[PDB]
Structures are given as C-alpha cells and as structure tokens.
Symmetry: C2
Subunit: 62 residues, 2 copies
Amino acid sequence: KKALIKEYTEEIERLKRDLAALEKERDFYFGKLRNIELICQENEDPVLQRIVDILYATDEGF
Amino acid sequence: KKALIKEYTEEIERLKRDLAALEKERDFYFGKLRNIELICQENEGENDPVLQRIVDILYATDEGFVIPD
C-alpha cells in the first residue's frame, strides 16, 4: 500500500510540474501573438496582411 | 487497495489529458509565431520599423530582453 502511494504521488507531482511549465509556455506564446495582433491593428501593408492571415488562420468569421 | 489505485489512476489520467490539450495549444501558438518569424526574416532587408517591433516581440525573453537570431 505505502509503496503504491509513493509511486503514484511522485508521478502526479511530476505531471503537475510539467503542466505548470507547459501552461506558462502557452501563456508566454499567446502574449506574443496578442502584442503582435495589437501592432497589426495600430498600423492597419502586404507584409502585415500576411501576418494577419497567420494570426487568424483558423478563423471562419467575416 | 483497488480503490486507492482507482483514485490515483483517474487522477493521472486526468493530468495526462490536460497535458495533451495544453501541448496542442502551445504548438498551435508556436506554429503561428514561427510562421511570423519567417515572414519577418524574408523582409528584414528593408529595416521596416513595424516589422522590427514584431521581431522584438518574437525574440523577447520573459524578462523583457531581446535575443536576436
């Protein structure tokens, strides 16, 4: 019983550390895209339009 | 205990679903930024101030320092 709890709690602790690092990385990249999205809206250029297409590549609106 | 393993298996199974969902989100965002970086690299010979601002966002660390590539 004690050995099983020891193994699973160590596995859970490892998964939760990887989850925290992955979500931190996800929010880090999402912040970059939103700041780039802000720059494209301020300067609303054929180069910027290609960047806008990437930002909303999977957007079905409009 | 069979009810102890079930308590920990379903918890690990829950965390692995969260990991798979987060990794898909990160790769989605990182793929966009990588495509944006390549567009800026193809047009860097003009020293466009707007594109340089975008590059400085791509290459900024979490402390705010820009590491060029």
